[PDB]
């Protein structure tokens, strides 16, 4: 147990983490070179400067009673016991407390004796409560703003799925709770929450690293641990070949050789450190320190032997010095200087307000009471920084909770010369996040893809539902109803598709599709048959007109021949109307004309049998009788609208005439009349031998043409492609051959 | 400054929560009657019993310096400074106080600096088990490590895998809730919400926690790790929101009938855990005989009397009617606290440790010798307190559970009693419904639940495997069951996949059966038609067979006519072969039989147009035997990756196009030659049959137009293909019968 004591009228206490905590066999081991020794020397330098300042305490010399906490709260309490043992050298206030737990324990011990305490590194938000710490001051921002800064940093890079690890105690717990609260305020999810204990072993660190690696969707790790815990975690990650994007708090900071002892595991780590400026006077004072003239520091020999490895009492540690080697100031040095100067200013104000005549300690101040000082001068103090740069405006003041202003800096640990790893500032945080993306060599587009961390990757808009129970960390999207249009929520479709399947896959469109109607792309065959029939009947009609019905046409009556020409002519035209799109003006003719097409052909055969002028007129009127049934059916069949869609194969609409569905009923009635007329003539006659034989061929041809339609009808069954329209063309085309066969030998030999 | 200071050779410190937390403005307000007064009197009762004993510290009087912690660690630390003021004023050998975990930890941090042993009676925090931070600490109660595990088993017993956790900040609630999460993960227990209440909380703040618990109705069970005062506010807050929850609380609630003050409707059906202990019969008489007039050593007793009985004692009339002085503590209004024997054991443990120390450092004298004038706390704790073993002072069991001793960590043995709050007999009271001693054993047969039965606290509704497949959204407690295609079976619980093409899932969908449904059928609607024509046509062939030798010489037709009559007979049986449902070997016979049937019939007709005749006809059929000869045993099923997925038909898929091509070529050749050869040459024989055979030949071309053309389109159907085949073949056979009809009618006429 070493102690650093100096003489003076007023003695100020001190607590610094000079030594790092060891294992079970030793309370504390290696010397903390940057965070304990440099801070102790900064406090000593501040005290020396105050002791030579005429304006600040001209007649009062400030003493020092500084102790080493060995980075333990129990050891810190054991050391601070002698601070209050004298009260039962009196202590008017301690400038000490680097770790949050140490500061909390010291404040708890000191609140029973009314001893003010000003911290220089403790940033825990638990110390901001003035109900439990009535005499605790602090010159650093609390973690309440550091949590906001880290949450904003995570939100900036779309880091909505991260893993968190914090050290057990008083700093890690409050910080991680605040970070979780601020991440729930925004849209950030937490994957894994690990803890680091005080007696944490290497195997436990490996287990924590494995647990962190167990979540491949969270490539960003949020750190709220201490310096030693961060170093051990980095070593464990390095020895396990684990790569992570570390986002750490001020516990890591910009420590170059302390935490980043394994260069390579943390190459894109983002660290947040309290804003500070270098002090040239402190650098000059520290660079001139030697182990010979600095006899007032009991721990300087150990620091020398550690940073400049050699052996004392052997003529070995007498060549090197602190000037030639590079020197880097600790970030939390100006905070220690400000705390010491604030304590000195409070003491000076108390002396001025209590001893208005003498410049030394008058009898009214010799018992120093902490309550009055803390309530009057410690909290209500305002002065410029003792060693601030020329181009700045910084004031040392305490808020209502005795804290500092929430200003932070953002650092990244990059490599400059392929091995020269260093910390480079990339932004700051006072009220909002102002980051420099171009200064970070893993976020620029030229440096490669941005490392993102999401629980679920965003799937394509098409065939996605993103089912989410209330508010959930991440979503799962599944294809749903390919006939639905689109949706971005739990429901499969935001709008009703209706009879039109899906949409253009860009949202709610509900665009209509083509109906059952189709252009004559593959209907050339029906058209070709019509042209062949028209060409065949053109020559048949041409010879009849040229011969003036003299040779054979005027055999008996010369009337059936004229009527027969009309029947074949209208049969060819039936193919054209059937292959057209059903509309309000053309769809009505197909149903009415179907019965008439068979009636005219059958009438000619019936008229010939009846004959074997007036008869032709009677036959023409007889054919009109069958057309009356078509007109009667057309009373309701002519207006036809609707569709015959089915809950299958939604790509087709299947919209046609209402009479088209009823065309089967209409066709059945028409076919009945034609069949009966044809068979009666053939059997009755079974005149001229040639005429009688010719009638037999025509009578059988008409029946066989209609008979062959039945097997074809079952084949199609309204298939909408080569459908019942095809066989209607074929039977009409076959009927043209039937009509041609009647007159085929009439003029063949002429 | 109110305190109890009894003089004696050795003074034992005391810290009890006589006063509760208070409403901020005051350090501590109302008196804690159950956990602050009974425990305080239990320590005094034990001290008096020890001083009256002859085998425990004979001739040495034990003093007490008892202070009030006001249920807060900040005020307790100031009071604890009196115990260490002398070491920096009575000399304190040890401290028996410490009820709250936060209070005990703060005091232990200060006592370890002065080597003062401390024994706790109610602090169950697992943090205090660390012997590197709290060296001089012991307790007669188990840590929260076993308590958190005990409630995890209870949740697993009722399969409550989706619960909510409400805790309080400090050394008890935060530490206890951390252990619960670790135990919940091993039992697949998922946490819905994690709320924390603070020391400085208002009624609106407590209602915020209740509203947060109501955002997830699927979590009807709430796990509580709170203090006595914190639990009271939440229950009162839940009473103002008409919210009912299944409360599962730790020892902070226990069986204390003071949290539930006019709020029994919401706390009904709660499952609270209390440490296993037995009432002290001797303490029952001692507490029921204390009066404000005779009890003067307790400064807090007068305040306790004015609160429990609501009568004034200072001026005899301050709040209500005068105190009749005829009332006293009795079994009607007095119930012994659960942690009474622990206080007695804690006091006796320190007394027994000093007794063993006194018999070693003072070998001869029975008083306090010069060796024990300056007591050493390190030797008393490590060498005597940690290695103590004695029977309970007032125990009715005398079993192995009555032994008071400390383990390596200076803790007790984990034994908890499960209590259920229910309304029985018209009044509200607790009842033991289980016990936890390294094993859970409940009494569900006598547990009154909240609404009418065991609550269901699950994140996801458990979907039956009939048509639903579980899909994890990224967690292990909640899931969504999205159905998949009905022709795929789930493997075990989470994956439904197709077992190839041609199978159908089983009834339980644990496997897939082979597709049983087939399109083949016999004597069905689509087969009765074709067979009816076939049999009549087949019988028509027998009619020609009848006129074979009865009228042969008399007719002038006379064996080409007989050859074609037998040739078309193969056509009739070909229709019967086509309609047969199976095709193991006959499908090759169908193409060979039906294919040769046309060849024989057409060749015979062609022969009639023009020994030698038989040789020519046989030659055509001779090469038809080995047209393909590519086997017929395997029939490839027509089922494919179509929408049906429920029917399989083979139809002898092998070599389907080859038969059609061969038949078309043979049919095309015969019709052209036969028609050209016959024409009208001479019209020989009885009648002009040269044109008649041409008519039969011409009609067969139309029949040939029904073999190939109408086929190859819509013929992939099992029913359509078979029906078209027999109709076309039977029509051809009937046409040939027309040729022989004319000779037949001539004989009749
Ligand atoms: C994601 O990060 C980029 C900047 O790298 C930028 O687009 C924005 O800040 C974040 N959010 C979205 C929606 O892009
Ligand atoms: C659920 O708990 C009950 C006991 O009350 C019992 O059925 C079983 O242990 C658990 N599991 C199932 C599937 O019931
Ligand atoms: N502010 C952090 C770290 C301080 C430091 O060591 O730099 C704490 O309270 O522990
Ligand atoms: N088990 C509680 C004590 C409850 C009581 O008896 O007051 C704790 O550890 O704080």
Curated annotation (Swiss-Prot), chain A:
L-glutamate binds at residues 35, 39, 100, 121, 123, 250, 332. GO terms for biological process: behavioral response to nicotine; cellular response to stress; chemical synaptic transmission; G protein-coupled glutamate receptor signaling pathway; gene expression; glutamate secretion; intracellular glutamate homeostasis; long-term synaptic depression. Keywords: Cell membrane, Cell projection, Disulfide bond, G-protein coupled receptor, Glycoprotein, Membrane, Receptor, Signal, Synapse, Transducer, Transmembrane, Transmembrane helix. Disulfide bonds join 28-70, 189-473, 310-317, 355-362, 455-474, 459-477, 480-492, 495-508, 587-657. Residues 1-522, 581-591, 637-661, 717-726 are extracellular. Pfam families: 7tm_3, ANF_receptor, NCD3G. The chain crosses the membrane at residues 523-545, 560-580, 592-610, 616-636, 662-683, 694-716, 727-750. Detected in brain cortex (at protein level). Widely expressed in different regions of the adult brain as well as in fetal brain. Its main location: membrane. Belongs to the G-protein coupled receptor 3 family. This is Metabotropic glutamate receptor 2. The lineage of its organism: Eukaryota, Metazoa, Chordata, Craniata, Vertebrata. The gene is GRM2.
Curated annotation (Swiss-Prot), chain B:
Residues 1-526, 581-591, 632-656, 715-724 are extracellular. GO terms for cellular component: astrocyte projection; axon; dendritic spine; glutamatergic synapse; plasma membrane; postsynaptic density; postsynaptic membrane; presynaptic membrane. It comes from the Eukaryota. L-glutamate binds at residues 101, 122-124, 172, 251, 339. The keyword Transmembrane helix applies. The chain crosses the membrane at residues 527-549, 560-580, 592-610, 611-631, 657-678, 692-714, 725-749. GO terms for biological process: cellular response to stress; chemical synaptic transmission; G protein-coupled glutamate receptor signaling pathway; gene expression; negative regulation of adenylate cyclase activity; postsynaptic modulation of chemical synaptic transmission; regulation of synaptic transmission, glutamatergic. Residues 550-559, 679-691 are cytoplasmic. Interacts with TAMALIN. Belongs to the G-protein coupled receptor 3 family. G-protein coupled receptor for glutamate. Ligand binding causes a conformation change that triggers signaling via guanine nucleotide-binding proteins (G proteins) and modulates the activity of down-stream effectors. Signaling inhibits adenylate cyclase activity. This is Metabotropic glutamate receptor 3.
């Amino acid at each position: 147990k070493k102690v650093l004591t100096l003489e003076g009228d007023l003695v100020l206490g001190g607590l610094f983490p000079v030594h790092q905590k060891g294992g079970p066999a030793e309370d504390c081991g290696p010397v903390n070179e940057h965070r304990g020794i440099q801070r102790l020397e900064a406090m000593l330098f501040a005290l020396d400067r105050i002791n030579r300042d005429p304006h600040l305490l001209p007649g009062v010399r400030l003493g020092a009673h500084i102790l080493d906490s060995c980075s333990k709260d129990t050891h810190a309490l054991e050391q601070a016991l002698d601070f209050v043992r004298a009260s039962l050298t009196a202590i008017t206030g301690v400038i000490g407390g680097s770790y949050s737990d140490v500061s909390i324990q010291v404040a708890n011990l000191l609140r029973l004796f009314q001893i003010p305490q000003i911290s220089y590194a403790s940033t825990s938000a638990k110390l901001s409560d003035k109900s439990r710490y009535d005499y605790f001051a602090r010159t650093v921002p609390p973690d309440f703003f550091q949590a906001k800064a880290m949450a904003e940093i995570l939100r900036f890079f779309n880091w909505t799925y991260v893993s968190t690890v914090a050290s057990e105690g008083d700093y890690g717990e409050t910080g991680i709770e605040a970070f979780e609260l601020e991440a729930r305020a925004r849209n950030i999810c937490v994957a894994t929450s690990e803890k680091v204990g005080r007696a944490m072993s290497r195997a436990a660190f490996e287990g924590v690293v494995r647990a962190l690696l167990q979540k491949p969707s969270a490539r960003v790790a949020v750190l709220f641990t201490r310096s030693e815990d961060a170093r051990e975690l980095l070593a464990a990650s390095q020895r396990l070949n684990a790569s992570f994007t570390w986002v750490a708090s001020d516990g890591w900071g910009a420590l170059e050789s302390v935490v980043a002892g394994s260069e390579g595991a943390a190459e894109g780590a983002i660290t947040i450190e309290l804003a500070s400026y270098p002090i040239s006077d402190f650098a000059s004072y520290f660079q001139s320190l030697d182990p010979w003239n600095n006899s007032r520091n009991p721990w300087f020999r150990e620091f020398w032997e550690q940073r400049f490895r050699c052996s004392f009492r052997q003529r070995d540690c007498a060549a090197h010095s602190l000037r030639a080697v590079p020197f880097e100031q600790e970030s939390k040095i100006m905070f220690v200087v400000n705390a010491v100067y604030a304590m000195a200013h409070a003491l000076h104000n108390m002396h001025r307000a209590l001893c208005p005549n003498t410049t030394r300690l008058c009898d009214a101040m010799r018992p120093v009471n902490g309550r009055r000082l803390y309530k009057d001068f410690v909290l209500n103090v305002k002065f410029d920084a003792p060693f601030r740069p020329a181009d700045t405006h910084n004031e040392v003041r305490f808020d209502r909770f005795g804290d500092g202003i929430g200003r932070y800096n953002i650092f990244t640990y990059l490599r400059a010369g392929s091995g020269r790893y260093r910390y480079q500032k990339v932004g700051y945080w006072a009220e909002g996040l102002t980051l420099d993306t171009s200064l970070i060599p893993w976020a620029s587009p030229s440096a490669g893809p941005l490392p993102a961390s999401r629980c679920s990757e965003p799937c394509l808009q098409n065939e996605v539902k993103s089912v989410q129970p209330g508010e959930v960390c991440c979503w799962l999207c599944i294809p749903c109803q390919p006939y639905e249009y689109r949706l971005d929520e739990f429901t499969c479709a935001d709008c009703g598709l209706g009879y039109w399947p899906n949409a253009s896959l860009t949202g709610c469109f509900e665009l209509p599709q083509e109906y059952i109607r189709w252009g004559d792309a593959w209907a050339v065959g029906p058209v070709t048959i019509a042209c062949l029939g028209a060409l065949a009947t053109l020559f048949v009609l041409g010879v009849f007109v040229r011969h003036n019905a003299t040779p054979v046409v005027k055999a008996s009556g010369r009337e059936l021949c004229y009527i027969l020409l009309g029947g074949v002519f209208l049969c060819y035209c039936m193919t054209f109307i059937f292959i057209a799109k059903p509309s309000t003006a053309v769809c009505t003719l197909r149903r009415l004309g179907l019965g008439t097409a068979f009636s005219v052909c059958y009438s000619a055969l019936l008229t010939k049998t009846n004959r074997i002028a007036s008869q032709v007129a009677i036959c023409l009127a007889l054919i009109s009788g069958q057309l009356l049934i078509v007109v009667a059916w057309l009373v309701v069949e002519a207006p036809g609208t609707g569709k015959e869609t089915a809950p299958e194969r939604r790509e087709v609409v299947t919209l046609r005439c209402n009479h088209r569905d009823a065309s089967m009923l209409g066709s059945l009635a028409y076919n009945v009349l034609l069949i009966a007329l044809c068979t009666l003539y053939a059997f009755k006659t079974r005149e001229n031998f040639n005429e009688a034989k010719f009638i037999g061929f025509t009578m059988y041809t008409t029946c066989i043409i209609w008979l062959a339609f039945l097997p074809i009808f079952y084949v199609t069954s309204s298939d909408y492609r080569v459908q019942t329209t095809t066989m209607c063309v074929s039977v009409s085309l076959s009927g043209s051959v039937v009509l041609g066969c009647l007159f085929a030998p009439k003029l063949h030999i002429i | 400054r109110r305190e109890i200071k009894i003089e004696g050779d050795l003074v034992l410190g005391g810290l009890f929560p006589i006063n509760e937390k208070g409403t901020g403005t005051e350090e501590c307000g109302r008196i804690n009657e159950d956990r602050g007064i009974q425990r305080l009197e239990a320590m005094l009762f034990a001290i008096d019993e020890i001083n009256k004993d002859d085998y425990l510290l004979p001739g040495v009087k034990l003093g007490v310096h008892i202070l009030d912690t006001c249920s807060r660690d900040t005020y307790a630390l100031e009071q604890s400074l009196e115990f260490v003021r002398a070491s920096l004023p009575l000399l304190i050998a040890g401290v028996i106080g410490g009820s709250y975990s936060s209070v005990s930890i703060q005091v232990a941090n200060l006592l370890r600096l002065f080597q003062i042993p401390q024994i706790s009676y109610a602090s169950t925090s697992a943090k205090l088990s660390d012997k590197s931070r709290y060296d001089y600490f012991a307790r007669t109660v188990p840590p929260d490590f076993y308590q958190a595990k005990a409630m995890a088993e209870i949740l697993r017993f009722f399969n409550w895998t989706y619960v909510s956790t409400v805790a309080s900040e400090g050394d008890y609630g935060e530490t206890g809730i951390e252990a619960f999460e670790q135990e919940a993960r091993l039992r697949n227990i998922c946490i819905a919400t994690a709320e924390k209440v603070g020391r400085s909380n208002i009624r609106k703040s407590y209602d915020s926690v209740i509203r947060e618990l109501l955002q997830k109705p699927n979590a009807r069970v709430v796990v509580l790790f709170m203090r006595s005062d914190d639990s009271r506010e939440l229950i009162a807050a839940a009473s103002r929101a008409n919210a009912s929850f299944t409360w599962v609380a730790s020892d902070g609630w226990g069986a204390q009938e003071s949290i539930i003050k006019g709020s029994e409707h919401v706390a009904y059906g709660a499952i609270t855990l209390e440490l296993a202990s037995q009432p002290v019969r001797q303490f029952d008489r001692y507490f029921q005989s204390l009066n404000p007039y005779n009890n003067h050593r307790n400064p807090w007793f007068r305040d306790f009397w004015e609160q429990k009985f609501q009568c004034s004692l200072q001026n005899k009339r301050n709040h209500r009617r005068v105190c009749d002085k005829h009332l006293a503590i009795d079994s009607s209004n007095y119930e012994q606290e659960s942690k009474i024997m622990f206080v007695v054991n804690a006091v006796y443990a320190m007394a027994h440790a000093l007794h063993k120390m006194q018999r070693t450092l003072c070998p001869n004298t029975t008083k306090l010798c010069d060796a024990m004038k300056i007591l050493d706390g390190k030797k008393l704790y490590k060498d005597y307190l940690l290695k103590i073993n004695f029977t309970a002072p007032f125990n009715p069991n005398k079993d192995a559970d009555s032994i008071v001793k400390f383990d390596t960590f200076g803790d007790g043995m984990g034994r908890y009693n499960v209590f259920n709050f229910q309304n029985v007999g018209g009044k509200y009271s607790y009842l033991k419904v289980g016990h936890w001693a390294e094993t859970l054993s409940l009494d569900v047969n006598s547990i009154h639940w909240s609404r009418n039965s065991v609550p269901t606290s699950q994140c996801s509704d458990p979907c039956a495997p009939n048509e639903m497949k579980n899909m994890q959204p990224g967690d292990v407690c909640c899931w969504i069951c999205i159905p998949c295609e009905p022709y795929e079976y789930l493997a075990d619980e989470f994956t439904c996949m197709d077992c190839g093409s041609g199978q159908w899932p089983t009834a339980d969908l644990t496997g897939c059966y082979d597709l049983p449904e087939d399109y083949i059928r016999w004597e069905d609607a689509w087969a009765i038609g074709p067979v009816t024509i076939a049999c009549l046509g087949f019988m028509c062939t027998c009619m020609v067979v009848t006129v074979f030798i009865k009228h042969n010489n008399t007719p002038l037709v006379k064996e080409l006519c007989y050859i074609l009559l037998f040739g078309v007979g193969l056509s009739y049986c070909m229709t019967f072969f086509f309609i047969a449902k199976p095709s193991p070997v006959i499908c090759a016979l169908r193409r060979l039989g039906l294919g040769s049937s046309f060849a024989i019939c057409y060749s015979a007709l062609l022969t009639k147009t023009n020994v030698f005749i038989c040789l020519g006809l046989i030659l055509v059929q001779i090469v038809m035997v080995s047209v393909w000869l590519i086997l017929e045993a395997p029939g490839t099923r027509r089922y494919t990756l179509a929408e049906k997925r429920e029917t399989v038909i083979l139809k002898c898929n092998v070599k389907d196009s080859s038969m059609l091509i061969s038949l078309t070529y043979d049919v095309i050749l015969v019709i052209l030659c036969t028609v050209y050869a016959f024409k009208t040459r001479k019209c020989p024989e009885n009648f002009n049959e040269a044109k008649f055979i041409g008519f039969t030949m011409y009609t067969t071309c139309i029949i040939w137009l029904a073999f190939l053309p109408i086929f190859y389109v819509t013929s992939s159907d099992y029913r359509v293909q078979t029906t078209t085949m027999c109709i076309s073949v039977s029509l051809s056979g009937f046409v040939v019968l027309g040729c022989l009809f004319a000779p037949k009618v001539h004989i009749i006429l």
